[PDB]
Amino acid sequence: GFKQDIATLRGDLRTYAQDIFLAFLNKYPDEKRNFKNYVGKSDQELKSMAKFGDHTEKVFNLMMEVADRATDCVPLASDASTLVQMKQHSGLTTGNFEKLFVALVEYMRASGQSFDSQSWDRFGKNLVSALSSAGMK
């Protein structure tokens, strides 16, 4: 289920983080606006860049912690607040995070693995709600 999925993702986090983030950037190319440094690069190019690798893995590091601290796929208010008040996210709306979670769910549905896609989908909605409550537009 959800908790095991966390363990699975963490067992190969760098690879999962990159592949899910690339699936996000490719599904929603207009989302490349928030990452100027990534424009005009194939997936392999993006993976060569140390920053892509760095940033993305740190995103998933924190995502998995938020997932880990959730109850029944409902994240802590404190975690949502942190994500909203992060300066790197000054630009973002919950639509940005929605899209990330649609691509993550899709990724999981298309994997051969028994991910609990429905829980991640609930988790994504719950987080979007919690980001709203914590003041993200």
Give the binding site for ligand HEM (CB under 6 A): 31, 34-35, 54-55, 58-59, 62-63, 66, 83, 88-89, 92, 96-97, 100
Question: Is 79:18 a contact under the CB 8 Å cutoff?
Answer: no
89 annotated among ligand-binding-site residues = yes
User: Taking a C-beta distance cutoff of 8 angstroms, is the pair 99, 32 a contact?
Assistant: no
97 annotated binding-site participant: yes
Q: Which is nearer to ligand HEM, 91 or 112 (CB)?
A: 91
DSSP 75: -
**37 annotated ligand binder:** yes
Task: Report, in Å, the least distance between residue 120 CB and ligand HEM.
Answer: 11
Nearer to ligand HEM, 96 or 112 (CB): 96
Give the residue closest to ligand HEM by C-beta.
Answer: 96
Nearer to ligand HEM, 77 or 112 (CB): 77
Q: Which residues contact 74 (CB under 8 A, 6 or more apart)?
A: 126, 130
* Residue 88 marked in a binding site: yes
114 exposed, middle or buried (CB, 10 Å; 0-12, 13-18, 19+)?
exposed
Tell the burial category of 39 from Cβ atoms under 10 Å away from its Cβ (0-12, 13-18, 19+).
exposed
Binding residues for heme b: 36-37, 51, 55, 58, 88-89, 97
State the binding site. Answer: 36-37, 51, 55, 58, 88-89, 97
